[PDB]
RNA sequence: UAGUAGUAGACA
């Protein structure tokens, strides 16, 4: 029952008025928002901005630090061991004690070396001992640390220490970016560093060994950068070891490279607590590598041997973890560059270019600083701005110059950027990081994108970014207040009319809309919607408006959701499930979406903003709203998603695989139109032939802006045609839109305390604080918060574009012009089809003059370059809404290259594969060797789906497997190696207990993660059924142990449980009650209880779950604790109700497997599991591959697809009335449930009990010739197994 | 110019 709301009567909007208004507007000269891309224009932009910048920032003469770690290598690097560490430490301490300190840090390292060298024999015993046999000592209290009492430090050492230990207005100093001397100095320094780094110190298997091993790995393995990366991994491992809670308060000393590099770790705050830095100094022999003498503390000299003493570096957990995997990040980035070069050129890169690219990537990976990240973020949009015909490149170059240049690395990057931009504006695409010229724009874009993705996502300052997050919302809310005070609330809320716009001509502005324009756009949409009213009505009514609100997953999710205003006045930070449980506990029914709206309509919309933690120059904020707000937004967005699904020009509603097909079809029809010839009819029967041409406009900032009035959507909804009989649902959506006009915007507690700590307040901070009356929340109007009404705004933009199309058609009926609009994501693509004269257009100018003199004054803007007038009118009509096209990030080009790059970047199924590739070595879910290995392997399969070559994907999966094996000590030679205890080979060992996880990327892509375990179990059954061998049966018992552990990602045969380090309604029900209820109600395992009475218990069960409680605490500095215990080989596994080490679990596994006996019940279970295990292996085993003489040709990107039971099983277990009704509500066809159950059990028998049923329970970017069958996708992958050669299957 | 960070006062 939808309640009776109020409707909106239509206004007498006439398209004739808009047509006449457009005739006058186009009767005068209209300036273009974009500038013609000339090399001279770009050069003068840079030259002017250089002088402006020199004025803007105070000059600094000392370039600042950029290298996070300084070191040098002269010989091949050998990985550090404990004995090697001891020997190198002694030798290095002798060398250091032979030197003479100069600065306080030199005295500090001299004191540390003296203290280390004078430790007793028992100190050295406990210093280099594992935690098993470690005993405490007067000097050594923690294994890898020692103590340095202040009495053992000189005055200079204490001076350095207190300098380390210990505003409202300032100007950040910058180097002289206009001086040529500064540029030359920076270029020389970075060139020297890079030349130092480049200095030399299955069918897929054979393809790798011929192509990726030859021209990439064999080249980079001997470079200085490779060994420097390994040494950096060792140093970072030592720093991570010292970051524990018990250890970080002490001193430490490590040496590497036969005593040539020495690490001195000072007492620090532990990295387990947030906002901490580890302090250290590196002392190294001067030589090639990561050396910047200008930013060194000293250079001690002893007989033609120079020792470089670095500054004290404070590195946080994020940057330390980034530095740990710098070598792998550089390797993946260079492999991506390798694949892209091969695709662009059809050849392999030469050795020098590969070495230089690897050195550049490694230097970027070492220097993890926010300024470089911001520069590389700017370059991504700067490159399209100079490769198009028109763009906003002056604004982009000014924005690039709006920063200080503090270090030599920044100035070198700026010099390169200026050179590349001027080269591009004068044209064939020069490389940013090489001497290679490309043939495709996508190659250069991918180069810069790979450079950008080398920086981690959390480099912003916490306080500064938290302050910056609220500024846009506050500023645009203030602008809205100013507008509604100048014009009155009614005009701003309800819009102005056309005659008011004709009288004022300044009402066309952001946050202001014309009512006639909104009604006309809705009519234009209805011109299409009316012809398909049946499907639209079915789509709307298929949103299930009468099902319970909280019985949907989205309404009981684990995402953040704001709660209530607290006594301090802040907005509570909560979870969706908590609010769901609270509402269920405070009422007795399960209301529907409309019923919840009725119950909560009176309350105010509330929202707070949190950091997204991205790697853009400015971090974006994510808005967290309350429950009634979510209900209102759900109503509006469900309605508009149902409506928007039937409009072709709206692309947000597309799934993601249809989006690419739709955009390809739009481009295809645009190309088809230009193949024709347009003719102009004349009275004298003398036609003029006009040549059709296309212009591509990639329009930025069309969907959302903090500068909009959500009140236009009310009239849009009122005038939009649906197939429903009445206006009840439409009135409900209009009312909900009315209920989100005003918002209570809360400032976060962090920023509140930040401002509170301040004594005086600057004018900008004062103006910001004035927005919040009580100091906690202020009111926002007009601007709906980001990411809340996407389909609504996208459809509104589509309607506006259609309105412009109709207006232009009415203005010029004598011209044959083509328009295609694609409002995808926040961007939009406009394709203007215009006509140019063929031969001098002698008749064309005469015709235009005749039109103008005949009274059609608006023909003046069509005389030459009519696409400019098209864009001018389109932009004006969009502004008649509240859509302002961004004049800096919009490019106008005659080719669809910049747009294609932007669109594929925006699409979630076509993001660059290097972004996912670099993410497979970081942020692994820290729980267990098997789960981490599966998470890492699955990320490399996703990269292959996104377009990674099988060789690059294989390289990345090998690197990730090596990293995971190092984390847990599984790899051969370390104590956690399973082959040390179990009497099987490493390849024959189950993955959950060590075991070779390394596999072909093809096996992982097709057969999935765990196929190694499946093959192991299948071969074990075959051996025990055909041979009954003793040691061959030994594998059988190991699997049975895992089930014993499991009973006491998915795992086919058990796992090993590891420790996990960690509510209001989580305790209202006793745990035994939850156990009894779950045992009684088994059908709810596959469905969600609907009725409130047991939905509450189901939700409390969902809260009291180790997996769920682990999920709510994912990103935390305490995650380092688990990896430290795993690296230190502590008691991290669970066995027989106790926490034991991995070696204990392996020993128990060996005992159980030795003492295993078959009962044929295990044999039946294993046979069932093997039967449950497309037969991808046989296809991969049986295939023919040969090299035909041809050249590899790369076509356009194409998206394909790679490939109810819970209702039936739930219906099987339903006993009482409530479970029975819930399974009928969930099931689509309750009539056929019994038949489906019968046929399923018949198939199970031909292939019953509850336990067996309980245990039984992809978009790919390819070329155009591939089909939608998984066999076609696999054959495409096999054909693309060679980078340069063509394979025939 | 101890580091990170920043033309919002931080870690401290």
Curated annotation (Swiss-Prot):
Please state where this protein is localized. Answer: Host cytoplasm, Host perinuclear region
The record's catalysed reaction(s) read: RNA(n) + a ribonucleoside 5'-triphosphate = RNA(n+1) + diphosphate
Activation/inhibition comment: Inhibited by 2,4-dioxo-4-phenylbutanoic acid (DPBA).
Q: What does the entry give for GO biological process?
A: cap snatching; DNA-templated transcription; negative stranded viral RNA replication; RNA-templated viral transcription
Q: Give me the comment on cofactor binding.
A: For endonuclease activity. Binds 2 Mn(2+) ions in the active site. Displays nuclease activity with Mn(2+) and also some with Co(2+), but not with Mg(2+), Ca(2+), Ni(2+), and Zn(2+).
Q: Which cofactor does it need?
A: Mn(2+); Mg(2+)
Q: Which residues bind Mg(2+)?
A: 827
Q: Name one GO molecular function term.
A: RNA-directed RNA polymerase activity
Any single GO CC term annotated in Swiss-Prot or TrEMBL for this entry:
host cell perinuclear region of cytoplasm
Domain remark text: The N-terminus contains the endonuclease activity (endoN). The central region contains the RdRp activity. The C-terminus contains the cap-binding region.
Known role: RNA-dependent RNA polymerase, which is responsible for the replication and transcription of the viral RNA genome using antigenomic RNA as an intermediate. During transcription, synthesizes subgenomic RNAs and assures their capping by a cap-snatching mechanism, which involves the endonuclease activity cleaving the host capped pre-mRNAs. These short capped RNAs are then used as primers for viral transcription. Cleaves ssRNA substrates but not DNA. Seems to downregulate the expression of its own and heterologous mRNAs through its endonuclease activity.
Know the name of this protein? RNA-directed RNA polymerase L
Q: What is the lineage of its organism?
A: Viruses, Riboviria, Orthornavirae, Negarnaviricota, Polyploviricotina
Complete-protein stretch covered: 226 to 1601 of 2151
């Amino acid at each position: 029952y939808i309640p009776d709301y109020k409707g909106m009567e239509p206004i007498g909007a006439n398209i004739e008025d808009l047509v006449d208004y457009s005739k006058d507007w186009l009767s005068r000269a209209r300036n273009f928002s974009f500038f013609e891309v000339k090399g001279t224009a770009v050069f003068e932009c840079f030259n002017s901005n250089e002088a402006n910048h020199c004025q803007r920032y105070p000059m600094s003469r000392k370039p600042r630090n950029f290298l996070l770690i300084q070191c040098s290598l002269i010989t091949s690097y050998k990985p550090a061991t404990t004995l090697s560490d001891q020997i190198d430490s002694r030798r290095a301490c002798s060398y250091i004690l032979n030197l003479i300190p100069d600065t306080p840090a030199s005295y500090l390292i001299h004191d540390m070396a003296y203290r280390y060298i004078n430790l007793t024999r028992e100190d050295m015993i406990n210093y280099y001992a594992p935690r098993i046999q470690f005993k405490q000592t007067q000097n050594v209290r923690e294994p890898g640390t020692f103590k340095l009492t202040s009495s053992m430090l000189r005055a200079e050492s204490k001076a350095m220490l207190d300098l380390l230990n210990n505003k409202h207005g300032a100007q950040i100093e910058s180097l002289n970016i206009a001086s040529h001397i500064v540029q030359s100095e920076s270029v020389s320094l970075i060139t020297k560093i890079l030349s130092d780094l480049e200095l030399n110190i299955t069918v897929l298997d054979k393809f790798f060994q011929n192509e990726t091993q030859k021209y990439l790995i064999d080249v980079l393995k001997k470079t200085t950068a490779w060994h420097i990366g390994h040494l950096i991994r060792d140093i970072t491992e030592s720093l991570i070891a010292h970051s524990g809670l018990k250890r970080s308060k002490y001193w430490s000393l490590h040496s590497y490279n036969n005593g040539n590099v020495i690490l001195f770790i000072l007492p620090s705050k532990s990295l387990e607590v947030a906002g901490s830095f580890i302090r250290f100094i590196t002392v190294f022999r001067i030589g090639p590598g990561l050396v910047d003498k200008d930013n060194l503390d000293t250079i001690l000299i002893d007989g033609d041997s120079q020792w470089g003493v670095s500054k004290v570096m404070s590195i946080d957990l994020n940057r330390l973890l980034a530095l740990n995997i710098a070598f792998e990040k550089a390797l993946i980035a260079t492999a991506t560059w390798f694949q892209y070069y091969t695709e662009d050129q059809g050849q392999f890169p030469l050795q020098y270019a590969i070495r230089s690219v690897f050195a550049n990537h490694f230097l970027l990976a070492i220097c993890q600083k926010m300024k470089l990240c911001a520069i590389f973020d700017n370059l991504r949009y700067l490159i399209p701005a100079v490769t198009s015909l028109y763009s906003g490149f002056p604004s982009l170059i000014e924005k690039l110059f709006e920063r200080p240049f503090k270090s030599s690395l920044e100035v070198y990057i700026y010099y390169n950027i200026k050179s590349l931009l001027v080269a591009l504006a004068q044209n064939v695409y020069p490389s940013f990081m090489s001497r290679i010229v490309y043939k495709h724009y996508r190659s250069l874009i991918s180069e810069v994108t790979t450079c950008f993705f080398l920086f981690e996502k959390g480099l912003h300052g916490n306080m500064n970014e938290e302050a910056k997050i609220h500024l846009e919302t506050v500023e645009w809310a203030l602008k809205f207040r100013e507008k509604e005070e100048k014009y009155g609330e009614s005009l701003v809320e309800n819009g102005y009319m056309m005659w008011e716009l004709r009288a004022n001509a300044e009402l066309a502005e952001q946050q202001l809309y014309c009512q006639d324009a909104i009604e006309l756009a809705a009519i234009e949409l209805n011109k299409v919607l009316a012809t398909k009213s049946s499907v639209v009505a079915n789509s709307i009514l298929s949103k299930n408006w009468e099902e319970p609100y909280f019985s949907q997953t989205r309404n009981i999710s684990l995402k953040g959701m704001s709660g209530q205003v607290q006594e301090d006045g802040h907005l509570s930070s909560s979870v969706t499930i908590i609010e769901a449980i609270r509402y269920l506990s405070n009422s007795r029914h399960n209301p529907s979406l409309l019923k919840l709206y009725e119950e909560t309509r009176e309350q105010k919309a509330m929202a707070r903003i949190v950091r997204k933690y991205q790697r853009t120059e400015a971090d974006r904020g994510f808005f967290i709203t309350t429950l009634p707000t979510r209900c209102r937004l759900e109503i509006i967005e469900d309605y508009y998603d149902a409506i928007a699904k039937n409009i072709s020009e709206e692309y947000i509603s597309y799934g993601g695989e249809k989006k690419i097909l739709a955009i390809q079809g739009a481009l295809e029809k645009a190309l088809r139109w230009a193949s024709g010839e347009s003719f102009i009819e004349l009275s004298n029967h003398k036609f003029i032939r006009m040549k059709r041409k296309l212009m591509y406009v990639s329009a930025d900032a069309t969907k959302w802006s903090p500068g909009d009035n959500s009140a236009k959507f009310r009239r849009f909804t009122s005038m939009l045609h649906n197939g429903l009989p009445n206006n009840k649902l439409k009135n409900c959506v209009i009312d909900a839109l009315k209920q989100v006009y005003k918002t209570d915007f809360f400032m976060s507690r962090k920023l509140r305390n930040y401002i509170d700590s301040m004594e005086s307040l600057d004018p900008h901070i004062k103006q910001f604080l004035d927005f919040f009356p009580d100091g906690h929340h202020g009111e926002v109007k007009g601007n709906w918060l980001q990411g809340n009404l996407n389909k609504c705004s996208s459809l509104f933009g589509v309607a506006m574009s259609l309105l412009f199309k109709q207006v232009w058609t009415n203005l010029f009926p004598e011209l044959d012009c083509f328009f295609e609009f694609a409002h995808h994501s926040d961007d939009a693509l406009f394709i203007y089809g215009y006509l140019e004269p063929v031969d001098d257009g002698t008749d064309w100018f005469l015709f235009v003059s005749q039109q103008i003199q005949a009274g059609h004054l608006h023909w003046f803007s069509v005389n030459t370059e009519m696409w400019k007038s098209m864009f001018n009118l389109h932009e004006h009509i969009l502004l008649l809404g509240s859509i302002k096209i961004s004049p800096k990030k919009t490019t106008v080009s005659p080719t669809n290259a910049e747009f294609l790059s932007t669109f594929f970047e925006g699409c979630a199924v076509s993001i660059p594969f290097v972004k996912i590739l670099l993410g497979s070595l970081s942020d692994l879910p820290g729980l267990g060797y098997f789960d981490d290995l599966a998470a890492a392997q699955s990320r490399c399969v996703k990269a292959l789906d996104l377009g990674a070559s099988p060789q690059v994907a294989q390289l990345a999966v090998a690197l990730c497997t090596s990293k995971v094996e190092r984390l847990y000590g599984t790899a051969p030679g370390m104590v956690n190696h399973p082959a040390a205890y179990l009497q099987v080979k490493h390849t024959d060992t189950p993955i959950p207990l060590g075991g070779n996880g390394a596999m072909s990327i093809m096996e992982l892509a097709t057969a999935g993660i765990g196929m190694s375990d499946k093959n192991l179990l299948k071969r074990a059954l075959l051996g025990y059924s055909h041979k009954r061998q003793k040691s061959m049966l030994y594998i059988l018992g190991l699997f049975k142990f895992l089930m014993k552990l499991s009973d006491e990602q998915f795992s086919f045969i058990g796992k090993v449980q590891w420790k996990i380090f960690t509510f209001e309604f989580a305790d209202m029900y006793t745990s035994k009650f939850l156990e009894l209820w779950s045992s009684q109600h088994v059908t709810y395992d596959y469905i969600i209880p609907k009725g409130r009475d047991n939905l509450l218990i189901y939700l409390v069960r969902k809260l009291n779950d180790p997996s769920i409680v682990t999920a709510m605490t994912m990103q935390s500095p305490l995650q380092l604790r688990f990896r430290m215990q795993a690296k230190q080989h502590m008691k991290v596994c669970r066995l027989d109700g106790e926490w034991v080490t991995f070696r204990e679990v392996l020993a128990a596994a060996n005992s159980f497997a030795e003492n295993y006996s078959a009962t044929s019940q295990d044999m039946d279970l294993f046979q069932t599991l093997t039967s449950c295990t497309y037969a991808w292996k046989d296809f991969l085993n049986g295939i023919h591959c040969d090299v035909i003489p041809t050249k590899q040709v790369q076509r356009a990107k194409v998206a394909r697809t790679f490939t109810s039971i819970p209702a039936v099983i739930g219906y099987k277990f339903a006993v009482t009335v409530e479970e029975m009704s819930d399974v009928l509500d969930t099931a689509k066809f309750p009539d056929s449930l019994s038949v489906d159950l019968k046929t399923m059990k018949d198939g199970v028998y031909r292939e019953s009990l509850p336990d067996v049923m309980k245990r039984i329970a992809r978009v790919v970017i390819v070329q155009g010739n591939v089909e939608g069958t998984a066999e076609a996708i696999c054959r495409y992958w096999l054909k693309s197994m060679s980078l340069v050669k063509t394979i025939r299957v």
